[PDB]
Design a protein around this ligand. Structure first.
Ligand SMILES: NS(=O)(=O)c1ccc(NC(=O)Nc2cccc([N+](=O)[O-])c2)cc1
Ligand SMILES: [Zn+2]
Length: 258
């Protein structure tokens, strides 16, 4: 509630409340494409979202989350580097004030305009709160966004943002199909990392897709009209809610493709 993305509470301050900010497996990272190792034993990713049940969209003061019913195996991620079944609980984005920045992961130091995170937790741990305490508790599928053509599957999200302008606002958001947010290819890089916001827990297997999706200038402009603040507090536009790349330290990024 103290932390954020401003000059006085931004990523460079987080370590004072959350010392794991300087830990051994922090995210995001830069993905050096020439140094990533193809790993022929990585299985294809299995994204099974056909029974997904979205419930609600919420402005939480740092981003907006579209939440799903995760009380049964309705939308799950399996395969790739993962063992077992991971259930979709929410997705959200990080984005910039300018098209030239906004993603958390970078690719050969390149920043994308935004980055989508589809967050899943390992069902062997029973619930999300237990999963985040485990080194293999979460799998987050990260997808880069660049500005170009509109993404039709994103539009329903863009159109509800006026109803959740400020922190703490939520709206019903049922029957949304997250398959409309995926690129054509599921080729990916993978490495062990962390949540990219406090509490920065080191519980995530990151799976970052090689192929970005394109969204229109009008779509990302609507992201930038959201507010970090609550209604009746001074207006601060919700932009640049991304953490910069952290040191790779003792990790190797693996690639599913060559
Ligand atoms: N930026 S990220 O590393 O992908 C990230 C992913 C997940 C979280 N945390 C949550 O999803 N927390 C949470 C906790 C309770 C309930 C729900 N939810 O219903 O969406 C979500 C923080 C950062
Ligand atoms: Zn995120």
């Amino acid at each position: 509630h103290h932390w954020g993305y401003g000059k006085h509470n931004g990523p460079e301050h987080w370590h004072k409340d959350f010392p794991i900010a300087k830990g051994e497996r922090q995210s995001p990272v830069d993905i050096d494409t020439h140094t990533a190792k193809y790993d022929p034993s990585l299985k294809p990713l299995s994204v099974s979202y056909d029974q997904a049940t979205s419930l609600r969209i919420l402005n939480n003061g740092h981003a907006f989350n579209v939440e799903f019913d995760d009380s049964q195996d309705k939308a799950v991620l399996k395969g790739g580097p993962l063992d077992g079944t991971y259930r979709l609980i929410q997705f959200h984005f990080h984005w910039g004030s300018l098209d030239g920045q906004g993603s958390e992961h970078t690719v050969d130091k390149k920043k994308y305009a935004a980055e989508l995170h589809l967050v899943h937790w390992n069902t062997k741990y029973g619930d999300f709160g237990k999963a985040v305490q485990q080194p293999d508790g979460l799998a987050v599928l990260g997808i880069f966004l660049k500005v170009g053509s509109a993404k039709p599957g994103l539009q329903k999200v863009v159109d509800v943002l006026d109803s959740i302008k400020t922190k703490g606002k939520s709206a019903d958001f049922t029957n949304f199909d997250p398959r409309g947010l995926l690129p054509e290819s599921l080729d990916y890089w993978t490495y062990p990392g962390s949540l990219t916001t406090p509490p920065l827990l080191e519980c995530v297997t990151w799976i970052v897709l090689k192929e970005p999706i394109s969204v229109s200038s009008e779509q990302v402009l609507k992201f930038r009209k959201l507010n970090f603040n609550g209604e009746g507090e001074p207006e601060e536009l919700m932009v640049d809610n991304w953490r910069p790349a952290q040191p790779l330290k003792n990790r190797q990024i693996k690639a599913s493709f060559k």
